[PDB]
Paper text:
MiD51 and MiD49 are anchored in the mitochondrial outer membrane via their N-terminal ends, and most of the protein is exposed to the cytosol. MiD51 and MiD49 specifically interact with and recruit Drp1 to mitochondria and then facilitate Drp1-directed mitochondrial fission. Crystal structures of the cytosolic domains of MiD49 and MiD51 were reported and indicate that these proteins possess nucleotidyltransferase (NTase) folds and belong to the NTase family. MiD51 does bind adenosine diphosphate (ADP) as a cofactor, but MiD49 lacks this capacity.
To understand how MiD51 interacts with Drp1 during mitochondrial fission, we performed crystal structure studies and solved two types of MiD51 crystal structures under apo conditions. Type I contains the cytosolic domain MiD51129-463, and the crystal space group is P41212 with one molecule per asymmetric unit. The overall structure consists of a central β-strand region flanked by two α-helical regions and looks similar to NTPase family crystal structures published by two groups. The Type I and Type II crystal structures are almost identical, with a RMSD (root mean square deviation) variation of 1.14 Å for 329 aligned Cα atoms. By comparison, we found that all of the released crystal structures of MiD51 from PDB, which include different nucleotide forms (Apo, ADP or GDP), lack distinct conformational changes when compared to the Type I and Type II crystal structures, with RMSD variations ranging from 0.97 to 1.88 Å. And the ADP/GDP binding sites are almost identical, which implies the structural rigidity of MiD51. It was reported that MiD51 can form dimers primarily based on the crystal packing of MiD51, but we did not observe such packing in our two crystal types. DBS1, containing R234, Y240, F241 and R243, is located on an exposed loop of the N domain. We define this area as DBS2 (Drp1 Binding Site Two), which is located on α12 and α13 in the C domain and forms a surface for Drp1 binding. We also determined that MiD51 forms dimers through an interface close to residue C452 located in the C terminal region, although the majority of MiD51 protein exists as monomer.
Numbering used by the authors: 133 to 463
The structure:
Amino acid sequence: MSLQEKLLTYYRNRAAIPAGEQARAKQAAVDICAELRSFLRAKLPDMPLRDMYLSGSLYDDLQVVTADHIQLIVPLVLEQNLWSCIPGEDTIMNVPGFFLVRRENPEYFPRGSSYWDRCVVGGYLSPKTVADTFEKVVAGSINWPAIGSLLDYVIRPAPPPEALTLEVQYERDKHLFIDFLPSVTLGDTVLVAKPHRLAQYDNLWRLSLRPAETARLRALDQADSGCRSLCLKILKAICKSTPALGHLTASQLTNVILHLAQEEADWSPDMLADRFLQALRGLISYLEAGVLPSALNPKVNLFAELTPEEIDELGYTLYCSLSEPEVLLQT
């Protein structure tokens, strides 16, 4: 049979979402998203935000390759007057590519001049505070299954520390997750409050990379009708199924593939199996080294959040795969 054929087989059987189901999944998210606006259009203002949006509603599949959960961005509006963002590199700590947001010009515009002065601690805008002030609309200031009833789904938020995340069964067989993620844009630079992990103590703002990451990927495979996304989807599925490998994230996997695209031109369909093995060796190499640089921002190490016991486990599992990759398909 061969790896190629087995990989394709695993794709269709374990990894891929049927066109129909996918559409219905998109519908759910788009509907949930609509109604959450209707909840905040009533509740607010006070908090200054643009409309919530779902990334990337332009693609059907919705970027659930690159991935984790469907992402519901909530853009916080800030005065470009009153706020500068300081790179994590130039701290006061030392943590690329996270950023501190510094309250500027008390020198001019005293406290109370912004809504966002109520989420400052120590001269700096605080993703955790911001996330919290937020999380106490979610789990559960919402009249939750009243919107469940309206649309014929089950909508319940995961219990903390993911009160931001939501579970929705869209059909009876299947279920689906939606992340709320607060975002601020200060000039060129866009940031999200996905907390760091340790964060020292608590904590900095995270540079958003998923949308750029998914755009390169979309584009490369457009260029040459190549098999980069397919190869990624399969690694993602294997990692979702194989408990040892669960510690690996969408972003990590995505960046392994992007580095491999930098190194290899070919990605014709018949190259799947080789590129697949190379991703495994790439992973092993990045894990040995303890660093996976972001393809888009080489100073950022995506493996910096992994605990060393995780790295340990992953490396061993991958090391053992290499001679019989077939075993990864039967988890």
